[PDB]
């Protein structure tokens, strides 16, 4: 049985490992299929327990990963691709 | 620099901790506001790398969390709510 303060703390806006499809990070590369099709990135998630407050990053950094670029029925090559990651998060008023 | 096999293994359909809004797990309780408004649950996620294949659970358990049920402008109480969790996942045709 998870105690209130545990859930509360563990659930509040922070960077959490998040599985993100590569195509949505790189919309312009539809001639390709990627393996993997998604990557594990640290991204702001959780609740602000508040409302039109939103859980946004205030500190970012890049990370470079080895992804298979595949041209379907023609070939495949493992290249380096770069992705955004979230270092700090914070609940901020919206627009 | 994250190596190919690291990424592939770590991205493929498993249970991962996932922040889920309570309202969506209990859409009938609109009178209430919850604190926290979301919970950390093990849920299937990631890529099947394949296509109309789909990352679904094949094994579940319930977990019970202490959550604050708030009746706006009237009162607040900590009660217990149960949430579905995901122990194993698999890539299945849709």
């Amino acid at each position: 049985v998870v105690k209130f303060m545990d859930v509360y703390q563990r659930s509040y806006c922070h960077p959490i490992e998040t599985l993100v499809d590569i195509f949505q990070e790189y919309p312009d590369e539809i001639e390709y299929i990627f393996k993997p099709s998604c990557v594990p990135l640290m991204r702001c998630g959780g609740c602000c327990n508040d409302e039109g407050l939103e859980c946004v990053p205030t500190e970012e950094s890049n990370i470079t990963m080895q992804i298979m670029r595949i041209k379907p029925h023609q070939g495949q090559h493992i290249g380096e691709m770069s992705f955004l990651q979230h270092n700090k998060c914070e609940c901020r008023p919206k627009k | 620099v994250v190596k190919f096999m690291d990424v592939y293994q770590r991205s493929y359909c498993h249970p991962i901790e996932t922040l889920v809004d309570i309202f969506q797990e209990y859409p009938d309780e609109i009178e209430y506001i919850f604190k926290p408004s979301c919970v950390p649950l093990m849920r299937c996620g990631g890529c099947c790398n394949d296509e109309g294949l789909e990352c679904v659970p094949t094994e579940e358990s319930n977990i019970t969390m202490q959550i604050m049920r708030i009746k706006p402008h009237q009162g607040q109480h900590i009660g217990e709510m149960s949430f579905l969790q995901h122990n194993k996942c698999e890539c299945r045709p849709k």
Epitope: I33, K35, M68, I70, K71, P72, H73, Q74, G75, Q76, H77, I78 | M5, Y8, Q9, Y12, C13, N49, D50, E51, G52, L53, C91, R92, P93
Partner: antibody, heavy 120, light 108 residues
Amino acid sequence: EVQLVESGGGLVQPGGSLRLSCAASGFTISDYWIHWVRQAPGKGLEWVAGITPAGGYTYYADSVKGRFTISADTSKNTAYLQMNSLRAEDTAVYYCARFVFFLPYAMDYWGQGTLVTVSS
Amino acid sequence: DIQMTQSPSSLSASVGDRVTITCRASQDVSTAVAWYQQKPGKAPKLLIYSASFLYSGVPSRFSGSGSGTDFTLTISSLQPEDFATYYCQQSYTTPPTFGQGTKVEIKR
């Protein structure tokens, strides 16, 4: 010309070990996964070992788990199948083969086979 | 734990005959199937990948079709050189397996 050149089979004692080489030329092996398929005398193709696409984990046939281990030296552009404590029923022609994504889930180049015969 | 059952186990067909080998996976596997021809003692050769696609180099009289559990190698017009053992293989859900094979001889 792309091809896969195996070697290193032949005659072994029961309980002995062997390691097969699968040397790639005309392409770079780190961009692929090399699977191993074998075939006993007058029997069908049995899949042996290889990194599988569901989970990316090296997987081994039940009949072989814990004795066979694939490795790879990408500076030699070669892959290996280390075979340990060989049982008589390992006697087969072993093929290595190029597992591919771009021709989905297919094996497009194969080595010529090496006879591995297990007998005292 | 998945299986692949080819039909028939073996057949004789005259030069010119339409030949159909079927292949029935006990579980669903999309179009993630290939067919390989293997001439006696020699390394298997890729005929068909992703269920219906013809590997480049292979003669047009080979075709593949199907998804789910039921799959079909067709040879529209059998040549004398086509005698071999034909295999289906699945490599998409673990474990990867082959069918038992279908030995084709030429009837004359």
